[PDB]
Write a protein that binds this ligand. Sequence first.
Ligand SMILES: O=C(O)Cc1cs/c(=N\C(=O)[C@@H]2CCN(S(=O)(=O)c3ccccc3)C2)n1O
Ligand SMILES: O=C(O)Cc1cs/c(=N\C(=O)[C@@H]2CCN(S(=O)(=O)c3ccccc3)C2)n1O
Ligand SMILES: [Zn+2]
Ligand SMILES: [Zn+2]
Lengths: 338, 338
Amino acid sequence: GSGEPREEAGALGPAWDESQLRSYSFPTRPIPRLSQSDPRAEELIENEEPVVLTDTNLVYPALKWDLEYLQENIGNGDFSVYSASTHKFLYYDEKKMANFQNFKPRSNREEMKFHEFVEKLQDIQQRGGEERLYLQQTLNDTVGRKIVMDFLGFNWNWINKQQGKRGWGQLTSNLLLIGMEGNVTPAHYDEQQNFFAQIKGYKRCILFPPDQFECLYPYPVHHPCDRQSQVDFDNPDYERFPNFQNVVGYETVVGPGDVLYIPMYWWHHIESLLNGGITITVNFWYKGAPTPKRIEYPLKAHQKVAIMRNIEKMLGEALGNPQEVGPLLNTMIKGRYN
Amino acid sequence: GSGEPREEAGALGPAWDESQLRSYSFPTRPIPRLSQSDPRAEELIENEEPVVLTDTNLVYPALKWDLEYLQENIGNGDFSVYSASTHKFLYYDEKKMANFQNFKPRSNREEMKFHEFVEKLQDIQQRGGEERLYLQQTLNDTVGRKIVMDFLGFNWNWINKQQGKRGWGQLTSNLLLIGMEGNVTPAHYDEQQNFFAQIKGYKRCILFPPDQFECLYPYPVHHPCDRQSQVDFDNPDYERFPNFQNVVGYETVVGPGDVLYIPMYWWHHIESLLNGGITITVNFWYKGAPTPKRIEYPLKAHQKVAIMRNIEKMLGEALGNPQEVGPLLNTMIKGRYN
Ligand SMILES: O=C(O)Cc1cs/c(=N\C(=O)[C@@H]2CCN(S(=O)(=O)c3ccccc3)C2)n1O
Ligand SMILES: O=C(O)Cc1cs/c(=N\C(=O)[C@@H]2CCN(S(=O)(=O)c3ccccc3)C2)n1O
Ligand SMILES: [Zn+2]
Ligand SMILES: [Zn+2]
């Protein structure tokens, strides 16, 4: 999967061991770890394939970040902090909750100050509780001068050259992620290009190419969990999701200084290693390049994914009610295309 | 189904008996036979429900038509004549035959003069052959003066008032249908409003409302047999088409002078009665009224049918190949909406 664990400099031991990885039913192949100066890494990014770049220095000034330094300097703004009773955080589109009245939400959001999230995490650790927290906040203007200086110290030269070379849209946001050990963001896909810059701790990243759509069974587009896989990776229901027995992933473990390119529409399952301490990540999201004027066949897998999304959307509007999308689609194919 | 057979005037016996009707697996209810002056008949047509009008005099001058009079006066143009080895005529869109290379056609068209079709039918009857023929030709300018006079004698006053009252488009064509006894046009639906004017002989008409789409399993839109039911009414495959066990039809027998309104998108199965002689029919097709500017919910069944047709069409163009429509639709719903 992730290969034999890397050895940290200065003979400080292995960065992790296989007992910090969760157990799943599918095989994986390693994502390549390359230098940013390696043309193989440019070839991968251009072909919209994942790659771990080891030496971008993208967030070099942020490698000194921890909770004390952040609490001291990140400012007095509000931070979105997500809770969870188990290791799996259950995200959902709150705007789409109206369409599914029989939807029980289980990972609630709560805005708080940074110093509150820090002492709330210290609250849990000593009381021995099993509640998990996950801070996920877009970096804004309300951060202190020191964080602004660190932010200005990012390798904007390298990443801006990446944005122009690939024809991507401009940077949409930076997401700061601080998570507890063992936290799991379940498999889902995003519609923007992602540079996943690891800062503190180690995160296991399992990626699935867009052509695995058939094996990962995303929720209906109108469901609050749109773009998330319905499959419970810890207890896969092979009767509902038989092609999950065919899924093959791409796996890597990113540590401080690593930058993982997650191509747009690629599924990713992200977990903070067991017993590995808190994790810190900053993401760089770019809107993908505009679709070519004339079409090249055969279509890319992510184009077919977008086609399916648009059919579901347009059908929900045409029928007036997203709940009728399913029965019409079954009416369309039953005994005609299946 | 069609009720007890009507008694012809002058004590000339029953117009038909139940032994001239084919045997099928589904129940039926009678289509109402009404006077054109009956408001119930106007209510049915306005609600796009079938009705048999008994006294339109729509094609009154044509009631004297037979093969001798037609051969004498219909002119020297070409007439499309369809052949068939069995009673079921297998029509298909020749333009869509490219998409389905593994399609074997079994009811071939052949253009000929009217006098040839007449003596070819006399050829078959005396040689005892089992080959069937079905003349289906749009009436054009190349018809003799006498047929023009008969055509001018149609009740244009009544039918034009119908066209304006319902907001329909203008008349698209008149189809002259001359068929042999026992001929069957299998179940299919049309996208225009139809006034089905019976002239000679009797035809059993079995209609299914558009909301029976699920029970009648039409071919893929890109298939040459688009808009036709895949179900063999003489040997229904309940394993492929389980909801055909739920279908209920509307049934009637039309004779000379009867006009059957077949509403747009209504399925119809039309058969010339066994041992009943040749049949003559003229159809009047009108494009339906333009769809209302703002939408009224819930949708009509035929609107959902049109929605499904457009998804299949647009998907075939987007993917570049109609053969990929099926697998993408299954990919879309398998384990997500089913
Ligand atoms: O725990 C982890 O490390 C894994 C993890 C935490 S958050 C996350 N992803 C996201 O938060 C967004 C939500 C929607 N998309 S988006 O449409 O591309 C977009 C991008 C920019 C602005 C708005 C929308 C990705 N991942 O994968
Ligand atoms: O044997 C019988 O009596 C039954 C029978 C014989 S032919 C027939 N139907 C048709 O020939 C057309 C083919 C396509 N449509 S259409 O889109 O509405 C249309 C209408 C006008 C111009 C062009 C297209 C109906 N039926 O039902
Ligand atoms: Zn994501
Ligand atoms: Zn028809």
